[PDB]
Amino acid sequence: SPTDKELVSQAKALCRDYINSRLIRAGVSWSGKLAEVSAILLRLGDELEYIRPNVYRNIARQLNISLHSETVVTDAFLAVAAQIFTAGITWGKVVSLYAVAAGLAVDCVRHAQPAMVHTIVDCLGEFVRKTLVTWLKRRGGWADITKCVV
């Protein structure tokens, strides 16, 4: 029965881990239950990019991002996050939120804006806190994502 504070802290730690996996895999990272969740998240995110490459691969081009400035990335992330959930919350939609955040973060890092990753993580953290946290607690928390596969 996690608290809202813990759920948000885990949301940001899961974001950092997912992003770190993607940066390392993209080749631009030149620097228990939780690990289970991270592996599921990466798996479901990858499946999303596999099935819908035109939407989740090349996030920056999809959103028409030219400058990787802090206001552009933050407004791009928030505007997509708002549209993702307008019709309800599901685990698949949460996965899509992380996939958008990581696609943006990879593009920032490739364009000499690695400082932006901290901002993306904070934006996802605050969006979860204000939009999703009560739904997560009804599911039993992040561990419920293990029910998204077998």
Write structural notes for this entry:
With 150 residues, this protein is an all-alpha fold. The chain has one domain (1-150). Helices cover 72% and strands 0% of the residues. Helix 1 (4-26) packs across helix 2, helix 1 (4-26) runs antiparallel to helix 7 and helix 6 (91-110) runs antiparallel to helix 7 (116-131). It is globular and about 40 Å long.
Total helices: the number is 8
Gyration radius over CA: 14 Å
What spatial form do the alpha-carbon principal axes imply? globular
Number of domains: 1
Largest sheet: none
Helix content: over 70%
**What percent of residues are in strands?**
under 5%
N→C terminal distance: 23 Å
Structural class: mainly alpha
Along the chain, the helix and strand elements come as: HHHHHHHH
Number of strands: 0
Protein name: Bcl-2-related ovarian killer protein
Membrane topology: Single-pass membrane protein
Motif (BH3): 37-53
Subcellular location: Membrane
What characteristics describe this protein?
monomer; 150 residues; mainly alpha; 8 helices; 0% strand; globular
